[PDB]
Amino acid sequence: GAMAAEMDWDKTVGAAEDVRRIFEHIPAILVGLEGPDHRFVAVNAAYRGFSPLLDTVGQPAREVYPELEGQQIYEMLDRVYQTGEPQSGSEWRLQTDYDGSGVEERYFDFVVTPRRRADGSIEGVQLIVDDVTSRVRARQAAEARVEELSER
Amino acid sequence: GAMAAEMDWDKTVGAAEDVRRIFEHIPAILVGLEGPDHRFVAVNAAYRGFSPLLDTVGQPAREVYPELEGQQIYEMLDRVYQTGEPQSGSEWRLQTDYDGSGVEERYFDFVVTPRRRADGSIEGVQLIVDDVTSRVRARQAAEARVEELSER
Ligand SMILES: CCCCCCCCCCCCCCCC(=O)O
Ligand SMILES: CCCCCCCCCCCCCCCC(=O)O
Numbered sequence: 001g002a003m004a005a006e007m008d009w010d011k012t013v014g015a016a017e018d019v020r021r022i023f024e025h026i027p028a029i030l031v032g033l034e035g036p037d038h039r040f041v042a043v044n045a046a047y048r049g050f051s052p053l054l055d056t057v058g059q060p061a062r063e064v065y066p067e068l069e070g071q072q073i074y075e076m077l078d079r080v081y082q083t084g085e086p087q088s089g090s091e092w093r094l095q096t097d098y099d100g101s102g103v104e105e106r107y108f109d110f111v112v113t114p115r116r117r118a119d120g121s122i123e124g125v126q127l128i129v130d131d132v133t134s135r136v137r138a139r140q141a142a143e144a145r146v147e148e149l150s151e152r
Numbered sequence: 153g154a155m156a157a158e159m160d161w162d163k164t165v166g167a168a169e170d171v172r173r174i175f176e177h178i179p180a181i182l183v184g185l186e187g188p189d190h191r192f193v194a195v196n197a198a199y200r201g202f203s204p205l206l207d208t209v210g211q212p213a214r215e216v217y218p219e220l221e222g223q224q225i226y227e228m229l230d231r232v233y234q235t236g237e238p239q240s241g242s243e244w245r246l247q248t249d250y251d252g253s254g255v256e257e258r259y260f261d262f263v264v265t266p267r268r269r270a271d272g273s274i275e276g277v278q279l280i281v282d283d284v285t286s287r288v289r290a291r292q293a294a295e296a297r298v299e300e301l302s303e304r
Contacts, residue, residue, distance in 0.1 A: 011208035013176050014184065014194035016168040022184030022194040023175045024165050027238065027263040028280040030182075032166065032174030042166035042174040056163035086179065111179040128180040128280075 029131065032115070033061060034124035038077050040064075041124065050131055051098045067096040067103060077112065080125050086113040091132060106133045181283065184267070185213060186276035190229050192216075193276065202283055203250045219248040219255060229264065232277050238265040243284055258285045 013019060023030060024044050032042035037060040048054060054064055062074055071094055080087055088111045097103050109130040117123045165171060175182060176196050184194035189212040200206060205216055214226055223246055232239055240263045249255050261282040269275045 008208075009172065009176075012200075013172060013196065014209050016172045018184070018186075019172040019175050019194045020161065020165060020168045022182075022267065022276075022278045023171050024161075025265060025267050026182055026184075026278050026280055027265045028180065028182075030174075030178055030180075032170070032178075034170075042171045044165065048164075056160075057166050113177060113179045115173065115177050126174045126178055128178055 029129040030126070031129065032124065032126040033077070036078075036081060038062065038074065038081070038125070042126070047129075053098065053100055065096040065098075068094060071095065077125060080112050080114050081122055084114045084116075084122055086111065088112070091136060106131060107136045108132060181281040182278070183281065184276060184278040185229070188230075188233060190214065190226065190233070190277070194278070199281075205250065205252055217248040217250075220246060223247065229277060232264050232266050233274055236266045236268075236274055238263065240264070243288060258283060259288045260284060 007013075009016070014022070023042065026044060027046060029046045029050055030042070030044045031040070031047055033039060034041040039060050040054060040057045043054060043057060061077070062069060065073075068074065073094070076087055079085060088109075090109055091107045092110070093105055093107050095103055095105050098106060109132050110127050112125055112127040114122045115124045115126055159165075161168070166174070175194065178196055179198060181198045181202055182194070182196045183192070183199055185191060186193040191212050192206060192209045195206060195209060213229070214221060217225075220226065225246070228239055231237060240261075242261050243259045244262070245257055245259050247255055247257050250258060261284050262279050264277050264279040266274045267276045267278055
């Protein structure tokens, strides 16, 4: 059959206002960024609940979490934006100020992909993030316990 | 300070067209459902790629995956929609036809939450889903391997 005509977004994805309300309430940290400076363009309630430091969308990510410039993150995002090669991480240990209580260590699982405009050029990136800090800490505590029982 | 006025969605979440584009391309299976019949209202490329059986949004989920009526799923969704109590699952083993190749077993991690309208009443639910079938099968194969090495 002939190649499919342009996507009918309303039918295939959902109406824009509905999709925004659902995105806002998806029970996972979701983030969309745009342009070569990785400006926040979409963030949901989960994101803002875990990291309430972001005011309105629009800022380059580096201005919100500058310490991550020492931890490969913006170099990584650049690569995705430039080459289109997606990336993921399992339990990446990162240190920055997430909620205004001070710099701290958190662990993250994530997947990041590029986003293309109609002509095929990359306009930004988006990610799912899982804050696994408490789960890593629980695993560590459980290991400490079995270590202690086995030693005594 | 006074209570905050109504959310400025454009500034807090993102512009509706932008947010829909980002939702569509989030590297995770995302699904929003509306009303007491759990009608699909938002689905992304990841969802449609893993389960290409859905045509346009709008159908009750039960019509697409009817077998799951034998596997607690619609009773679970009803509970979330009725009571507002969110639910999650780790490696739930479910059998239905996901891609038109026939009924098969898949394993899922998920989180499902309700979605409220302005007056506080629940208008639907939404979920993140992680298809963990291949990871469960890999774990099983690795266990079978250590079992066999230890037995010989
Ligand atoms: C924030 C820049 C995007 C880079 C994505 C790499 C994955 C690490 C996520 C760290 C960003 C801040 C974490 C936000 C939510 C949280 O602390 O759980
Ligand atoms: C399909 C709507 C019901 C949602 C209820 C529980 C979510 C876990 C079960 C997901 C079943 C559909 C899976 C589609 C994507 C895939 O097969 O990876």
